[PDB]
Amino acid sequence: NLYFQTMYDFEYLNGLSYTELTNLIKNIKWNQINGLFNYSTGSQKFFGDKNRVQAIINALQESGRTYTANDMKGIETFTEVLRAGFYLGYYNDGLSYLNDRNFQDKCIPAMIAIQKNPNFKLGTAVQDEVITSLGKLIGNASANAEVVNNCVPVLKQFRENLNQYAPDYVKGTAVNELIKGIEFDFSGAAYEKDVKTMPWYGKIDPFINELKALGLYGNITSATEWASDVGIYYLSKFGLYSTNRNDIVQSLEKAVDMYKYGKIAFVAMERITWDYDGIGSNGKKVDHDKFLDDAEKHYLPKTYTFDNGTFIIRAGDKVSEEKIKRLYWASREVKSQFHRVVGNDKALEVGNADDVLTMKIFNSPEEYKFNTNINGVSTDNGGLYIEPRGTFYTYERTPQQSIFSLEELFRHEYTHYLQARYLVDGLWGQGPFYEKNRLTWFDEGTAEFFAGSTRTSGVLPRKLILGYLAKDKVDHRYSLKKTLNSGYDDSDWMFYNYGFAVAHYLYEKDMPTFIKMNKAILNTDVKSYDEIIKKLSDDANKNTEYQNHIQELVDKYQGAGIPLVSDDYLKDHGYKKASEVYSEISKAASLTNTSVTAEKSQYFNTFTLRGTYTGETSKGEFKDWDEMSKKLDGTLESLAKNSWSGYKTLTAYFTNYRVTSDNKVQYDVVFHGVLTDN
Ligand SMILES: [Zn+2]
């Protein structure tokens, strides 16, 4: 169509002679051809002239024959043009002839020429790019056993310089693209056919052996591990085209043993399971689950059992016993504050997995990654609680690996365990309160909030979250409306920090609403919850209140702290007669109709004392809550003035607010602490 111009349209290229065209292609870059990968009338007529594409194929072959270490003879730009051809032909009827294997094979003479060149080696940028381009072309075109086995020298060269070459992006990419391209083509052709019917079947043993050597290199480092990963993955794939099935499975099994509980061993097992029907070289079925089970025992060998086996920590061998204890005692501080605010400590459902809380704490982030392999959950996080398993997965960490210590993070995630067991009825995230966007701010916001639980001072803000709140006031602070009604669509990284601010704002400045809101969720009453959220969002004064609270929180940053369990918990408390502890607590807290259970843990025993507290005439539910909190914290503080160090392990909460027939405040009250009497 066109006969005048440095970007080039198909209408112009279509008008050139094949010799003027091929020459032009040879000394431009692929991106200079407009709409190369787009299907048009112009690209239709460019490809679809079988003579012109065969002209391009021929030019490529001549480049393969003549390229040097410093000059690529336009092999990249040629390969991309052909790739565009086979790509458009796969997707667009009218260029259907390009999708035909018999036509794709017309590139093999070009490929063989490229490989016969003395410069077909890893080395300089040109030589590497040729190998890269070749692999990408094979993925869209074709290969046969001859071209595949001609890659064996490259794979040898790479292997022989693995520590120099495997880390290099360019050389690593070259080899990866070569293997990946060939496999894509072969699996494409072998798709849904008897694999013994393929030409290359049995003819690629030299290539397969090069993958073997790569996969079983053994002396891998963090930098080179992917290379041997590649080796094993593709050993399995290409080994489908070997006559000795058991020989391949045997090498995959050696990978498993050689690499045991590193990445490559998981890959090797996957290959045996998927590519070889999970049947070992000895012909017997491989115990995949035992391997996973062994992997977990390796990574999490230590078990620490608390509360008659209802709080179990499985941990890496380097996670501190001291830490383990601190986490137990943290759990109790958060639990208690949560029950105070919610007013229920009876599990909503009978028989759920969370009847036992299991925590799995890997030694490190590195080792944490294997938890996706082992337990099938994401490890792109600092931790995760899976409610239907009643299991929290996380890992020990230094300050460099995370801003959050293990205790801080657990304190947050433990609240999710509390929400599912004690607050939100039904299955986690799959009830009325999730049929619309309702609890997104709440679930995360209150978790950040309850993480700041203390023993005797209620819930306190956490310095790090206040740190986040020191960011652009300018336009950036969420309004109350935005925080309450914002979801996964409308939000950025500060969402949960403003959700915490709403939680805290309500806690400190509007407890009546916080209690109402919590009751609404507890009672499974979406109507009332929605009304509270609408009232809050519609009242501009409440937003002015809230905007101020945000500044107040920000002002508290300088002097703020990380609520963390005291060292007092870890001291040697010494003996005290049980009935004396129960009497002093019962008297001090004015409890009636008390009962106690004792529970055995790894390093100590505990007790849980339950009673009824009937006070003076009610001053209203919310003022009652305020005063009961000060009375109960006062009781905890005065008990810790006693000589027995064990009184410093106490946590307490109250539930089931009611008024009596004579208007007297009433609660169920619960204390928990260490027990040092047989
Ligand atoms: Zn969370």
Numbering used by the authors: 110 to 114, 117 to 789
The authors write:
Clostridial collagenases are among the most efficient enzymes to degrade by far the most predominant protein in the biosphere. Clostridia employ collagenases for nutrition (e.g. saprophytic strains) and host colonization (1–3). They are large multidomain proteins of ∼115 kDa belonging to the gluzincin superfamily of metalloproteases. Here we present the crystal structures of the peptidase domains of ColH and ColT and the collagenase unit of ColG in the presence and absence of the peptidic inhibitor isoamylphosphonyl-Gly-Pro-Ala bound to the active site.
The recently determined crystal structure of ColG revealed a saddle-shaped architecture with a distinct segmentation of the N-terminal collagenase unit. The collagenase unit is capable of degrading native collagen in the absence of the accessory domains within the C-terminally located collagen recruitment unit in vitro. The comparison of the isolated peptidase domains of ColH and ColT with the crystal structure of ColG containing the full collagenase unit plus the PKD-like domain reveals that the peptidase structure is unaffected by the contiguous domains. Although all peptidases adopted an open conformation in the unliganded apo-form and a more compact conformation in the complexed state, this breathing movement was most pronounced in ColG and least pronounced in ColH. Near the S5 site defined by the edge strand (Pro499) and ∼15 Å apart from the catalytic zinc, we could identify a structurally conserved calcium binding site. In the ColG crystal structures, this site remained unloaded because of the presence of at least 125 mm citrate in the crystallization buffer. As evidenced by the comparison of Ca2+-unloaded (ColG) and -loaded (ColH/T) crystal structures, the liganding glutamate side chain undergoes a marked rearrangement upon Ca2+ binding that allows Ca2+ coordination. The crystal structure analysis of ColG suggested that N-terminally extended substrates assist in their hydrolysis by employing additional interactions with the edge strand in ColG. The interaction areas between the inhibitor isoamylphosphonyl-GPA with the individual enzymes is largest in ColH (256 Å2) > ColT (248 Å2) > ColG (220 Å2), as calculated using the PISA server. This relation explains the need of ColG for N-terminally extended peptides to obtain full peptidolytic activity.
